[PDB]
CSV table of C-alpha atoms and ligand atoms in Angstrom, one decimal:
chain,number,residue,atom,x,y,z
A,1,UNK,CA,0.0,0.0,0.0
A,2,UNK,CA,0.7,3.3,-0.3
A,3,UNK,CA,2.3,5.3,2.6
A,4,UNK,CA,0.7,8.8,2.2
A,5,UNK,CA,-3.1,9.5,2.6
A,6,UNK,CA,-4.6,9.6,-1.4
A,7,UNK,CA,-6.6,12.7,-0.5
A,8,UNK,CA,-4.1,14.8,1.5
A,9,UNK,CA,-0.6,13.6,0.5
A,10,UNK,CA,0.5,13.1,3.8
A,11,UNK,CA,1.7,10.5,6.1
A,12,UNK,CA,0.5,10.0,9.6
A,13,UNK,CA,-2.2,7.2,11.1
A,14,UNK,CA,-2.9,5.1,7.5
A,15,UNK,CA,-5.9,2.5,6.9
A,16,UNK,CA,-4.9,0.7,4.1
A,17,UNK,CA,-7.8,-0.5,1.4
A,18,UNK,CA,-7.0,-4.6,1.0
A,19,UNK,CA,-8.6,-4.0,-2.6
A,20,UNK,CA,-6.1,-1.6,-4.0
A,21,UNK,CA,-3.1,0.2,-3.0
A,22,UNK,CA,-4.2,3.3,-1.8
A,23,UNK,CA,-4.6,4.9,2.0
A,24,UNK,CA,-6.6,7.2,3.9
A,25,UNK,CA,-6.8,8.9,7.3
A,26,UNK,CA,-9.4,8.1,8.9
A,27,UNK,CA,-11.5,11.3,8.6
A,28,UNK,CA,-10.1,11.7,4.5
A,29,UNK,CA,-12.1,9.2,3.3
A,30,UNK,CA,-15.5,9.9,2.9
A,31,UNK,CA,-17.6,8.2,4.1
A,32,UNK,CA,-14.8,8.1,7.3
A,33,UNK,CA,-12.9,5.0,7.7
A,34,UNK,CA,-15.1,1.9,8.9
A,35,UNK,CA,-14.7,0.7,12.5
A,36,UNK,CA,-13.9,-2.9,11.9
A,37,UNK,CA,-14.5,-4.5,8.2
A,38,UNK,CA,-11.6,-6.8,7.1
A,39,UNK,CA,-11.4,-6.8,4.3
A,40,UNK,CA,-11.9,-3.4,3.9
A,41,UNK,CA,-12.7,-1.6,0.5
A,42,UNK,CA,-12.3,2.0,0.0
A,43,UNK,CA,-14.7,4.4,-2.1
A,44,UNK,CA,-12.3,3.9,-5.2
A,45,UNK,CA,-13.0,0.2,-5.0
A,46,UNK,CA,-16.4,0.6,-4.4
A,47,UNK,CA,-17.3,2.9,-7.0
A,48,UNK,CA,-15.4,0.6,-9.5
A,49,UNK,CA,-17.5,-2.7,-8.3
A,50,UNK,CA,-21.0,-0.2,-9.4
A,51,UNK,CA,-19.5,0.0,-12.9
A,52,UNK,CA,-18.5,-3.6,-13.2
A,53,UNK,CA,-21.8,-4.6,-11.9
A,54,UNK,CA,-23.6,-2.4,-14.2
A,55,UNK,CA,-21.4,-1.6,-17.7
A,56,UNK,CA,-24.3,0.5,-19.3
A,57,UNK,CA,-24.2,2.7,-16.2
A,58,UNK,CA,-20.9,4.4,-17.8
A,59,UNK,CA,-23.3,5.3,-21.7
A,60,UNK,CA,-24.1,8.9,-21.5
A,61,UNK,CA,-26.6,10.7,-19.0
A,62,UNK,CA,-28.6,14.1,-19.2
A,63,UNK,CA,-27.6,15.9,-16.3
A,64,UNK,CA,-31.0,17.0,-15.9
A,65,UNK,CA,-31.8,13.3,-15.2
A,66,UNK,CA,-28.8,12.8,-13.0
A,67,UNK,CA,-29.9,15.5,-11.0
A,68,UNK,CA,-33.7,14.2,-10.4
A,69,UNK,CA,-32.0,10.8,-8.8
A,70,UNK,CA,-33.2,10.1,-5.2
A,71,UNK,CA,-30.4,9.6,-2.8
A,72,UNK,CA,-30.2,5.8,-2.8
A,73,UNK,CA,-27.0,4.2,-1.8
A,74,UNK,CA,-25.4,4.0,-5.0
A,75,UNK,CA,-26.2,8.0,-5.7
A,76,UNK,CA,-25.1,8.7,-2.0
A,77,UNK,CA,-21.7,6.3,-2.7
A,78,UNK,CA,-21.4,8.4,-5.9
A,79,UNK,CA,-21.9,12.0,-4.6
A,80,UNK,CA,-19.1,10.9,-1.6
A,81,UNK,CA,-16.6,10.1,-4.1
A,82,UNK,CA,-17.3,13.3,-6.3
A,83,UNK,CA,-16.8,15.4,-2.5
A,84,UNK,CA,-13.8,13.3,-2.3
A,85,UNK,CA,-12.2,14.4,-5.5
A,86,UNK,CA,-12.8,17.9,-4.7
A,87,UNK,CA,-10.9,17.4,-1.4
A,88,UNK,CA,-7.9,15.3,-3.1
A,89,UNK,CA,-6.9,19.3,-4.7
A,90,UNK,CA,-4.8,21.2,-2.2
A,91,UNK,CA,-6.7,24.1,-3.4
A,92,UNK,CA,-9.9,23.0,-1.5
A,93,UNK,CA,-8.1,24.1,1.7
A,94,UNK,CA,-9.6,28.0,0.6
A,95,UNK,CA,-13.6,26.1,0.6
A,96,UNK,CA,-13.0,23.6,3.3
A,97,UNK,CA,-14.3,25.6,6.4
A,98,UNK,CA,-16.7,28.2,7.1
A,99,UNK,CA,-16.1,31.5,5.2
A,100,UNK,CA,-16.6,35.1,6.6
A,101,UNK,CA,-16.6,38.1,4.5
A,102,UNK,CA,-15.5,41.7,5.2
A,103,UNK,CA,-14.1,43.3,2.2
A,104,UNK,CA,-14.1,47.0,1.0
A,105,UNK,CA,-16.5,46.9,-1.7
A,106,UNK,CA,-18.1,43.6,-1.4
A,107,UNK,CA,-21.0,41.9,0.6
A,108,UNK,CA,-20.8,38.3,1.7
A,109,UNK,CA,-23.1,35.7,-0.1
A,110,UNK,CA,-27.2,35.3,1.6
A,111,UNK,CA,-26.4,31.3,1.7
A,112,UNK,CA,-22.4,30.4,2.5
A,113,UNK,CA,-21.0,27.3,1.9
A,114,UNK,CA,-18.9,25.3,2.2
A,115,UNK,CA,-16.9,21.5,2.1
A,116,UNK,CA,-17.3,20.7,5.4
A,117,UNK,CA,-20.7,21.7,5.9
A,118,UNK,CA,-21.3,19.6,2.4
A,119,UNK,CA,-19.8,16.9,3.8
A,120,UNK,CA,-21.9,17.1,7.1
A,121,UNK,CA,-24.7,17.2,5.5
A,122,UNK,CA,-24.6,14.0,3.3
A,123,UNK,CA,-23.5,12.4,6.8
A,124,UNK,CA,-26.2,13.3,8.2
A,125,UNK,CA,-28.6,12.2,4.8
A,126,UNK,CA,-29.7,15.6,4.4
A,127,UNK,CA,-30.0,15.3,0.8
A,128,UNK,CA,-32.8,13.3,-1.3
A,129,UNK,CA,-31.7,14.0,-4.5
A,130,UNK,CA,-28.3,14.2,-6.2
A,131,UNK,CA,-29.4,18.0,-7.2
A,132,UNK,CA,-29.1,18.9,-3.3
A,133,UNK,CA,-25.9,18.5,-3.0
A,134,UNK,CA,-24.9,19.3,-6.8
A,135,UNK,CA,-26.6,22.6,-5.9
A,136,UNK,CA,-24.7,23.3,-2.6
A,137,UNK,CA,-21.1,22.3,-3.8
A,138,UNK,CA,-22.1,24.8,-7.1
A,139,UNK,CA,-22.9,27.6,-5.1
A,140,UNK,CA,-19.5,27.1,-2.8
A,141,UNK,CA,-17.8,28.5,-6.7
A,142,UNK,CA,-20.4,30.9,-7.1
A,143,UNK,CA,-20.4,32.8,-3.8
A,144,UNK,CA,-16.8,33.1,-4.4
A,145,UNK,CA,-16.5,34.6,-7.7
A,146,UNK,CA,-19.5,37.1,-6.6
A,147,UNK,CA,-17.4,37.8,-3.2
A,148,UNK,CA,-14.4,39.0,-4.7
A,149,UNK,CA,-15.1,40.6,-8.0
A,150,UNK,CA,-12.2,41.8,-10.1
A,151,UNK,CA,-9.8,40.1,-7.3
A,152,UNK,CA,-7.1,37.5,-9.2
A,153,UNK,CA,-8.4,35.4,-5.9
A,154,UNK,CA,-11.6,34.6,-7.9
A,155,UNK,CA,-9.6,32.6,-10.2
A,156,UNK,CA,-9.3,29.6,-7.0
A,157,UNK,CA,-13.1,29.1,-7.9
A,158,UNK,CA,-12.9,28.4,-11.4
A,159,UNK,CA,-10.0,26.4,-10.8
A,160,UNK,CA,-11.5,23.9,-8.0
A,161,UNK,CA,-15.3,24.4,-9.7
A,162,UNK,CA,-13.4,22.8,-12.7
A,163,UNK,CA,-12.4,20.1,-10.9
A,164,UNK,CA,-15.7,19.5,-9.5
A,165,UNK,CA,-17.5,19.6,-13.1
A,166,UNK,CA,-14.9,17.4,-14.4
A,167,UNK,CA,-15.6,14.8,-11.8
A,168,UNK,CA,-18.9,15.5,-12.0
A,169,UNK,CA,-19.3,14.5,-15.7
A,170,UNK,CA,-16.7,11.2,-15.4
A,171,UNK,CA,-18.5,10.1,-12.1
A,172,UNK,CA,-22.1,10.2,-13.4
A,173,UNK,CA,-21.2,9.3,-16.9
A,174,UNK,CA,-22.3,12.5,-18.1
A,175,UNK,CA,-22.8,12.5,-22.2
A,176,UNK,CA,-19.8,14.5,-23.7
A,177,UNK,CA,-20.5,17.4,-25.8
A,178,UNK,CA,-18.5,20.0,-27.9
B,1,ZN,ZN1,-5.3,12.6,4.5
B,2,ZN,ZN1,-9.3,0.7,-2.8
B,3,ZN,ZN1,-26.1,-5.4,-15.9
């Protein structure tokens, strides 16, 4: 296995998948790292078993039917990973905790968010649909660029709301367009 954490790129207190190579701290994987379970599979492993299971899951999706999913265990599994992929970018360090906003110029967003509370709330099963939380992790980017304007800062959320889309599309099979 590896011997830094997949999501954070460091060392410290490991759990190993026994599926694939990879590692987590405990609280890096999403959902966190399961009590007991030997073997144990992480969310990589499980999210390829879905696609093996299922081949015609990977042909191409609307998103406007994506979105209209309920939250069943396979759309929760999925919308974990896609949070995880947002958090394996160092640059999610600027949208991981809660935000405050005083700036010359500018007023903070009516509805902040941000990772954590993201992740929080599919903990807790807040969402019923994967629009929910495709919704909440869109407007994290959004309040951002609207926050600081004309700012080089603003770039950081086009940068990490790429990653998201990208992960987006590739994790719910999203049909490619030009
Ligand atoms: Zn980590
Ligand atoms: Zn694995
Ligand atoms: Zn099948």
């Amino acid at each position: 296995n590896s011997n830094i954490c997949e999501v954070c790129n460091k060392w410290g207190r490991l759990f190993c998948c026994d599926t694939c190579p990879r590692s987590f701290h405990e609280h890096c994987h999403i959902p966190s790292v399961e009590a007991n379970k030997n073997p144990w599979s992480c969310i990589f492993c499980r999210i390829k078993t879905i696609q093996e299971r299922c081949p015609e899951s990977q042909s191409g999706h609307q998103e406007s039917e994506v979105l209209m999913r309920q939250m069943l265990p396979e759309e929760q599994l999925k919308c974990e990973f896609l949070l995880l992929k947002v958090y394996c970018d160092s640059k999610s360090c600027f949208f991981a905790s809660e935000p405050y906003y005083n700036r010359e110029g500018s007023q903070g967003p009516q509805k902040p968010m941000w990772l954590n509370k993201v992740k929080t709330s599919l903990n807790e099963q807040m969402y019923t649909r994967v629009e929910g939380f495709v919704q909440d992790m869109r407007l994290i980017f959004h309040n951002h660029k609207e926050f600081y304007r004309e700012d080089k800062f603003t770039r950081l959320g086009i940068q990490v709301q790429d990653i998201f889309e990208k992960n987006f599309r590739n994790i719910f099979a999203i049909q490619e367009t030009s």
